[PDB]
């Protein structure tokens, strides 16, 4: 009934004593010699179709009927009747059938695994990755800041930064190609960005050069090439573009108020353009920010849609087959309060006082505030000029974050249901929200004012990291310690429906348990192939 | 599906610490003065950051591993280039192993519940709230009179 | 000539019973023995409270 | 008045294992896997896996 996701998370996890688990996440935890045992008849009773997640539901009226929602990808086949070794071997079939070429090695996957298992990740990296909103010119103004950040994180700790957000990855790949960043540090980002191109090449090679009508068949065979799948974070407007390029019916539920047409764009979206293109309304947007009822703002303050040559696929590949396997799904949605983090900057002494020279370090003359502890726990020495440039991204910065429930139709060969309500698939997209690695208590004690945990996905809803970010779910996984499983963690009902979801528990247990290597990335890409007859045709051909 | 974050070098250097007759007793008096408190550890951060950097750059071994809270605090704090590059990684690996073994024991116990509580206290004897760690600094004693 | 397996899971019908876990009958058989053990230890049987 | 071995959790089999085992990953895994109880539902969770 509202925009604000902090109260959405808080009213679910306040006094949560009953922690019930889904039946698709219950079977997911069994082996195949135990699933077919006659004691688990209450889970074998509704496993009677390889494509459909039949559930009885609840006796709402007098007599309740069963509902069958599609298992879209082959990854949603359960761990009993499709184990992790089977998908890991299908990945090695897929790697030689489509002739995939791994550009990364175990070194790159190791240095990406050592960041999500690092509790010493600087929270200053989250505030620069939050003050940039996937914008290009916001990254141009912070080239010395991030060239200080990645170098100070690579020389000291050996890991590479900003690897949670694809936008920072591609901005580092194109802008930081000089000798600003280090050689091997840039090499790791180059490998990370090249493997998504290679996996998109292999998915295009599996999809083939066959077209249905005028459109290709690649949206009918895989889910990563499907334009009706959205990446979990939408920093710019990929929603109106989804309304344009869809032959099916997207029904974007932006705070209990849907919209299914492009003529209703400014009724539901407000484009945040460039900095010079908003200079005639800086004070208007700030008055809408400071003075405004943001609680019920059914408007998205999104950026403009840039149209990169790869349509939407490298975002989906990075967020679905690279990060949920390199990190073992140890991430959660990091909703940022944006007026509280730019109150932290543009304050505290030298950011407001211009008496200091612009190339002097801030930490020897920073008062005892939340910015000084934000750089004390991280041990980086930025100048005052980069912090002034980073605070300067506040007039065109959006006010809050909010999650939005995109409810697109199923594929045309997956729309055979009797009811029209389970002919659809849902996808919660975190608008202007980050994704986070593991927090410490020293980080949570000083960034409780800035960020808040949003468990909203299967790979981005880990309670091993949300309990380090939200104190009210840490008592949830103290009371019920079985909720620490990524497949069985309770997520908010307004924020994540399991049965109506692209990636269910079956893929959440492959993500959270596989060893991070090349065979796991190829196995996760090869379990994104749909259970559609065009996928059967394009798999029999290879 | 356990994943060891610890290699053989970390175990072979923890065994190097434990078989050291010349282990400094000053690292016992520092842990005695702190005794597992978070407020007392941040007073002595420029003390322990010199301690475990002269023990590392002197002998190759890592200090304070004889007590859990004294390396939990080194996992939280002291990653801000206070310790050396290859010495903080050993404490981080020792702390990450315990989370990996906790996840493995939780996956062993499963996602089934009896009554209203879990079966982690019933399957294993490490997920049992009744068993206490052998070294107490804070109050873990009023707690098991309320939850058990 | 079918190859039926015998898991641990089939033996749970007898390994989960409160007769396999009670010591009452073995102690009833040992306390009623006509010739018990001659070497008694009393080293750490019971805690003494200081 | 400090340690009565019969009324304990970890007994002489545990110390006899830990004093002889070579310190590696298989010993850490064996010590983690010998802390499982002997409940009926400790055998249920070992029959499932």
């Amino acid at each position: 009934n509202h925009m604000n996701v902090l109260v959405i998370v808080d009213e679910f996890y306040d006094n949560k004593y009953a922690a019930p688990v889904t039946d698709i996440a219950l079977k997911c935890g069994l082996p195949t010699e135990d699933f077919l045992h006659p004691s688990n008849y209450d889970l074998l009773r509704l496993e009677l179709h390889p494509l459909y997640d039949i559930y009885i539901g609840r006796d709402a009226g007098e007599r309740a009927r069963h509902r069958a929602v599609h298992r879209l990808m082959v990854g949603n086949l359960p761990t009993p009747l499709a184990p992790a070794a089977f998908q890991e071997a299908r990945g090695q079939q897929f790697e030689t059938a489509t002739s995939l070429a791994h550009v990364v090695d175990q070194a790159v996957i190791e240095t990406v695994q050592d960041t999500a298992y690092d509790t010493a990740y600087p929270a200053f990296f989250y505030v620069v990755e939050a003050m940039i909103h996937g914008f290009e010119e916001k990254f141009v103004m912070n080239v010395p800041l991030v060239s200080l950040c990645i170098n100070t994180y690579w020389e000291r700790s050996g890991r590479l930064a900003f690897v949670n957000s694809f936008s920072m990855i591609k901005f580092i790949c194109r802008h930081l190609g000089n000798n600003a960043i280090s050689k091997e540090a840039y090499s790791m980002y180059r490998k990370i960005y090249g493997e998504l191109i290679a996996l998109e090449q292999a998915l295009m090679r599996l999809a083939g050069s066959d077209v249905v009508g005028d459109e290709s068949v690649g949206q009918y065979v895989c889910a990563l090439l499907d334009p009706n799948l959205l990446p979990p974070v939408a920093y710019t407007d990929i929603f109106t573009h989804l309304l344009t390029v869809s032959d099916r019916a997207p029904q974007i539920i932006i705070g209990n108020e849907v919209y299914a047409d492009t003529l209703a764009a400014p009724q539901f979206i407000e484009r945040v353009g460039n900095m010079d293109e908003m200079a005639a309304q800086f004070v208007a947007l700030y008055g809408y920010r400071v003075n405004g009822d943001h609680d019920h703002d059914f408007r998205l303050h999104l950026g403009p849609y840039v149209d990169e040559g790869h349509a939407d696929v490298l975002e989906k590949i990075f967020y679905y087959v690279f990060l949920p396997t390199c990190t073992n799904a140890h991430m959660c949605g990091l909703g940022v309060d944006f007026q509280h983090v730019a109150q932290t900057l543009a304050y505290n002494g030298p950011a407001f006082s211009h008496h200091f020279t612009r190339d002097e370090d801030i930490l020897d003359n920073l008062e005892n505030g939340t910015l000084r502890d934000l750089l004390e726990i991280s041990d980086l020495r930025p100048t005052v000029g980069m912090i002034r440039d980073l605070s300067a991204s506040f007039m065109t910065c959006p006010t809050f974050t909010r999650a939005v429930r995109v409810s697109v139709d199923n594929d045309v060969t997956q729309q055979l249901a009797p009811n029209p309500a389970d002919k659809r698939t849902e996808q919660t997209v975190l608008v202007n929200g980050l994704v986070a690695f593991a927090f410490s208590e020293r980080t949570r004690a000083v960034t409780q004012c800035l960020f808040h945990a949003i468990p909203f996905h299967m790979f981005y809803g880990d309670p091993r990291v949300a309990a380090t970010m939200h104190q009210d779910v840490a008592t949830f996984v103290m009371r019920n310690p079985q909720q620490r499983a990524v497949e069985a963690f309770n997520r908010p009902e307004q924020l994540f429906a399991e049965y109506r979801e692209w990636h269910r528990s079956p893929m959440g247990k492959y993500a959270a348990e596989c060893l991070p290597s090349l065979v796991s990335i190829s196995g996760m890409t090869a379990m994104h192939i749909k259970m559609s007859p065009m996928a059967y045709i394009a798999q029999a051909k290879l | 599906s356990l994943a060891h974050v610890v290699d053989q070098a970390v175990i072979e250097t923890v065994q190097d610490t434990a078989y050291d007759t010349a282990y400094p007793a000053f690292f016992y008096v520092v842990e005695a003065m702190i005794h597992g408190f978070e407020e007392k550890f941040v007073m002595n951060v420029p003390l322990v950051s010199l301690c475990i950097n002269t023990y590392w750059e002197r002998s190759g071994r890592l200090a304070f591993v004889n007590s859990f809270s004294m390396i939990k605090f080194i996992c939280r704090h002291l990653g801000n280039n206070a310790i050396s590059k290859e010495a903080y990684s050993m404490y981080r690996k020792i702390y990450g192993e315990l989370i990996a073994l906790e996840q493995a024991l939780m996956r062993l116990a499963g996602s089934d519940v009896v009554g209203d509580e879990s079966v982690g206290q019933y399957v294993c004897a490490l997920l049992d709230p009744n068993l206490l760690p052998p070294v107490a600094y804070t109050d873990i004693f009023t707690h098991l009179l309320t939850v058990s | 000539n079918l190859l039926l397996a015998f898991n641990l899971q089939n033996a749970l019908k007898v390994l989960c019973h409160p007769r396999l876990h009670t010591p009452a009958h073995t102690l009833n058989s040992l306390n009623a023995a006509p010739a018990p053990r001659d070497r008694r230890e009393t080293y750490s049987l019971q805690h003494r409270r200081p | 008045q400090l340690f009565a071995e019969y009324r304990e959790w970890h007994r002489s089999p545990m110390g006899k294992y830990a004093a002889e085992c070579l310190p590696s990953l298989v010993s850490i895994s064996g010590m983690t896997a010998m802390h499982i109880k002997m409940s009926p539902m400790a055998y249920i969770a070992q029959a499932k896996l």
Binding site: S39 | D112, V114 | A11, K13, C16 | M41, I44
Partner: peptide, 20 residues
């Protein structure tokens, strides 16, 4: 009783009788 009816349900409660 929860433990008793969990144990009794998770295990089950000419076939040759085959004891252990």
């Amino acid at each position: 009783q929860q433990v008793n009816d969990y144990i009794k349900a998770k295990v089950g409660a000419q076939q040759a009788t085959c004891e252990i």
